[PDB]
Each structure stands twice: as C-alpha cells, then as structure tokens.
C-alpha cells in the first residue's frame, strides 16, 4: 500500500458539511463513501442526499441516530439521488424518493473491515474512503485545531465520520461539523499506538460500499 493517501487530491471528496443539531452523522458518513466510490468508478464527483437516507433508512432512527452500514445497504438495493434534488432539511421527514425520479447513483454491496485492526483499515482506505466511528464527546476532540491528535479521548464511540486518507503516523478523517471545526473540517488522528481500539476508538466499526 502507498505511504501517503489523500482522496481529496484525486478529486474524490466533496466540500465539508455541517449536520447541525440533528443526529444524522450516520447519513453524512455514508454519503462521503458514496461520493468517493462513484468518482473512483465513474469519473464524476457529485453530492448525494443525506436527507434521503435520514428519511428512507427504516433500520435507523432519523435524527436520533443511525447506522452507516444500513444506509449503504439501502443505496446498494435502491440507489440515491443528488443532494440538490433532495436537499438537507435537518429534520426527519417521510421518504420522498419516489417523487424524485430515477436514482442518480447505485452501488452493488457493502463490506465490513475486521475491527481493532489498523492495517485492515489502512488497506481499505487505499482503495476508497471508508466509513468509521469514534468517540467525539471529549472536549479535547471538540477543541482540536490541527496537528496529529493523540487525545485524550476514550473508546466509547459515539460519532460516525469518514477516513479519506492516511500517512505514516496518522489517519485523515472528514467530519460533518462544518469547516469551522478542526483543520478546515478535518482531523489527523494518531495511528500506531499500543491500543487495539485505536485512539478515540477509531478501529471499532468500519464499512465501505462496493460497486462493479
């Protein structure tokens, strides 16, 4: 695998968003991976709808929270519309996918990374952006501005984000808290400690879509 990865430099990452007060991190996580795989597979970089997942993933709980893997399964079975055709309203509503015309994109499956395994996650990121989870409730994570973050933070994960790259001592993470948080919306999380959870629980639960 390469020494350095950054899918932004391949034009596979859309601008940073802000989820607001809604508990929709799981949908923003999933869309990052969708935007990435469609660019890698088709050549187009486009913004897809987090609201559609919020409204239509019957296995999640709207603004109470949810699962990136179930969002990705829904996109594998049905598809997803463009974000501008189905914009973010910040509250759950009824599923309006049928009123939006044919889907803009569709994947063919979902895969899971074996947990607590830094190298398995690195291998997946080299192929495409990966949905991951972490503990974001600590003040240190909330006040982060740049550099390689070593914590403090525990492993009680609570927040889905996306890994869009890595380097020798870090993994590169795109958050959905606006550009005003972190390194222009991003954080470099330290890798290579002697902790099997990863720092901030980073290796707890990672998934990615597949698209023939």
Q: In the complex, which residues of this chain contact Cl ion (CB under 5 A)?
A: 169
Instruction: Consult the annotation and say whether 153 binds a ligand.
Output: no
What is the C-alpha to C-alpha distance for residues 199 and 176, in angstroms, rounded to an integer?
19
State in angstroms the smallest separation of the CB of 139 from Cl ion: 22
| Element housing 109 (H / E) | strand 109-113
- The alpha-carbon radius of gyration of the chain (Å, integer) is 16
Active-site residues, by number, are: 25, 159, 175
Q: Give the CA distances from residue 176 to residues 20, 83, 113, 140, 209, in Å, rounded to whole numbers and listed in that order.
A: 9, 15, 22, 17, 19
- Closest residue to Cl ion: CB criterion: 169
Nearer to Cl ion among residue 12 and residue 189 (C-beta): 189
Nearer to Cl ion among residue 77 and residue 169 (C-beta): 169
Phi-psi region of 67 (alpha: psi -120 to 50; beta: other; left: phi over 0): beta
Nearer to Cl ion among residue 169 and residue 196 (C-beta): 169
Sign of the CA dihedral 97, 103, 108, 110? Answer: negative
Nearer to Cl ion among residue 67 and residue 197 (C-beta): 197
State in angstroms the smallest separation of the CB of 150 from Cl ion: 7
| Element housing 35 (H / E) | helix 25-42
State in angstroms the smallest separation of the CB of 162 from Cl ion: 22
Known binding-site residue numbers: 25
Known binding-site residue numbers for E64: 25
Known binding-site residue numbers for leupeptin: 25
């Amino acid at each position: 695998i390469p020494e350095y990865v950054d899918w932004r430099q391949k034009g596979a990452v859309t601008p940073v968003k802000n989820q607001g007060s809604c508990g929709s991190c799981w949908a923003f996580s999933a869309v990052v991976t969708i935007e990435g795989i469609i660019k890698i597979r088709t050549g187009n970089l486009n913004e897809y709808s987090e609201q559609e997942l919020l409204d239509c993933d019957r296995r999640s709980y709207g603004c109470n929270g949810g699962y990136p893997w179930s969002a990705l399964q829904l996109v594998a079975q049905y598809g997803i519309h463009y974000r501008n055709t189905y914009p973010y309203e910040g509250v759950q509503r009824y599923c309006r996918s049928r009123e939006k015309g044919p889907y803009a994109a569709k994947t063919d499956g979902v895969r899971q990374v074996q947990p607590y395994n830094e190298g398995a996650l690195l291998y997946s990121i080299a192929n495409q952006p990966v949905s991951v989870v972490l503990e974001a409730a600590g003040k240190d994570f909330q006040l982060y501005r740049g550099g390689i973050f070593v914590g403090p933070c525990g492993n009680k994960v609570d927040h889905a984000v996306a890994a869009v790259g890595y380097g020798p001592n870090y993994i590169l993470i795109k958050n959905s808290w606006g550009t005003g948080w972190g390194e222009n919306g991003y954080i470099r999380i330290k890798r290579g400690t002697g902790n099997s959870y990863g720092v901030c629980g980073l290796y707890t639960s990672s998934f990615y879509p597949v698209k023939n």
